[PDB]
Amino acid sequence: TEEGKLVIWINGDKGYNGLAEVGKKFEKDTGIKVTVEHPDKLEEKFPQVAATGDGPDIIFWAHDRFGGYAQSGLLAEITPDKAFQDKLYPFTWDAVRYNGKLIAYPIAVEALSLIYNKDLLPNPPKTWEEIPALDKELKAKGKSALMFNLQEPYFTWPLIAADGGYAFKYENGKYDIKDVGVDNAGAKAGLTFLVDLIKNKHMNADTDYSIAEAAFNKGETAMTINGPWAWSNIDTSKVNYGVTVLPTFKGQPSKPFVGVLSAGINAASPNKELAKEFLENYLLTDEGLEAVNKDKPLGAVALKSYEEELAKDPRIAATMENAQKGEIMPNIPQMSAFWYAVRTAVINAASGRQTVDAALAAAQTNAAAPGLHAIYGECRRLYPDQPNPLQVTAIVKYWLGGPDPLDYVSMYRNVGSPSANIPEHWHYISFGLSDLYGDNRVHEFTGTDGPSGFGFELTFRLKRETGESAPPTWPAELMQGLARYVFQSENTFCSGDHVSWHSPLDNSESRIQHMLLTEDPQMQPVQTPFGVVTFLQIVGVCTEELHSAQQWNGQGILELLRTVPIAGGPWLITDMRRGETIFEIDPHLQERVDKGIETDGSNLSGVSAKCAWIRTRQLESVHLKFNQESGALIPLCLRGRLLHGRHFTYKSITGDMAITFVSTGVEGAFATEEHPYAAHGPWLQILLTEEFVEKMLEDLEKLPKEYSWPEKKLKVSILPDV
Ligand SMILES: OC[C@H]1O[C@H](O[C@H]2[C@H](O)[C@@H](O)[C@@H](O)O[C@@H]2CO)[C@H](O)[C@@H](O)[C@@H]1O
């Protein structure tokens, strides 16, 4: 925000210019500059940035969002003298009251209406069922019957609710968030009807707000569906239009979700009193509302005085008839999640991606899945561009006996950063490792503190190939494999961990057959009522790189991968095509690993190797035998472990034999400085004092190799071992 200046956000389809004129008058009378912006996806931007401390002093939007905003603590409480509260209709105040407090100034009442071309269609239909036949009549003379935005569920909700659909059941003043009604026969009936319209080529699933508006206003289609804001543009057009009641479906009224355009004050705003002055004494006046209304009609206003003038307009009348027949939107926080569920359901059902029953079943479950929704939020923040990415769904859900524990795996196109030389890739995000539903169907509920589910979800970044229109799906199957491992082992992962796989990740001949895990570079962790969720990105590595990771640590090797862009880069993007290890690409990298093992120690506690040396015996002489391969690890054993007071264990692949190098100062060994070499059966422990260890290392500064010291002998060999 800012002090002495007023920043306002309002959607671009509203009358921002009129509002700007009111801002001009305010700037004249008070000297405070009033800036009016209309960013895309503002409502979302607003929750997103309000916390950091950027944001609008005032935010305009339908009330349905505000309850959420208020629960997050983004909104200041508004305080009007009774003198002012009486100027507005009580029910508009109702729409903006949350948890007993007023959290926004109600501005206007928005409801969708059926807008029709009087020239093309003298008497509009009273029912949806006529439209198919009606379209056919018009198609005969190169026109269409109906076109409206199919991308926002706001416009198809009236039809869906008509025969029984609902968001949350309201009884006794309480909305039951668990009782969602988008899955019932009614909702199925309306959405099935829309889908059938598209099947019989009376509508097109691609159609959006702008195509619908252009079509109707140019006079290409007979009808459209929209709110009062739209009219101004139609007035400019050649079309003579009427605004009327929406068509009935199966004998029942269409029930549009009525909104109440409201203005909220940012809790992080310095100028809150300036905001109150502007809204109460400048905007919410006959003069202010008229100013805005000339630009784009607001609908049925909340200011009694001005509304009395407006109510005469037959268009407003129709607006209020549709409004009455429909319901007013709830303002609870769960609305946003509901809207998202339905938006996906409609689009997928209309495009043929899914059936009506499957889409609505998914929307039904997802309307009340705070975890799935809290993740979808962050996904939405990263990809405001992509509302519905290709998404792999597990059709037999895990908690019904299904094999795949990941309910969903979303697949995004990431454009990368040209400035950072980061290539375009596909970004897979998984859903199911965390608590999505929080009703104990998969994961025990644990509360807000602590990890939701296993506390993380999996992500993956697959370098996009030349001409790849769509992301491949094999990474989802991979993610299902890992997910199963976690679910059966009950074993969590942390940034740095490695996964040994030893098969091409993509079931090709690729050299990438193992995985490392790191924090997703872009995905921020999220607060889920069911817990906190972090995002672990999978990074494909060669067998050599995995080995480096075991010998040193995961973290170091990931960074090495970041420096070699071809092998990952800053965001650690997996290229299944890669043919060389990072070490074949830059040998100085091996050097970096050796320095790390020296100064960090190594995470390798033991190896299965070709090698050789109940009562706890003691020995004064010891002769070890090693394969070249296990002989290679001796420096690691000493430099990497004993010099860090860490023990190391060779176990013979055949034998029951074992050799555990023990630093002076390790705990629980049966080897003492007094008696360094001791054995319990086939298991041998030898304790080396640090000085001797250093000496030994210098001595090791190819085959056969023999070493001797006063105490003990060491042999390096090739085929004595079977
Ligand atoms: O698409 C779902 C959407 O519906 C409503 O958004 C309306 C808004 O109320 C109107 O003022 C106008 O801008 O049309 C919007 C839809 O394009 C809800 O208010 C919103 O929360 C929801 O996302």
Author numbering: 3 to 615, 626 to 713, 722 to 742
Pull verbatim passages from the article behind this deposition.
SUFU is an essential intracellular negative regulator of mammalian Hedgehog signalling and acts by binding and modulating the activity of GLI transcription factors. It is demonstrated that GLI binding is associated with major conformational changes in SUFU, including an intrinsically disordered loop that is also crucial for pathway activation.
Although the crystallized protein was intact, both SUFU molecules in the orthorhombic asymmetric unit show no apparent density for the C-terminal domain residues 279–360, suggesting that this region of the molecule is highly mobile. This construct was expressed and purified in the same way as MBP-SUFU-FL and crystallized both in the presence (crystal form I) and absence (crystal form II) of maltose. Collectively, these results imply that the IDR in SUFU is dispensable for GLI binding and repression activity in cells without upstream pathway activation.
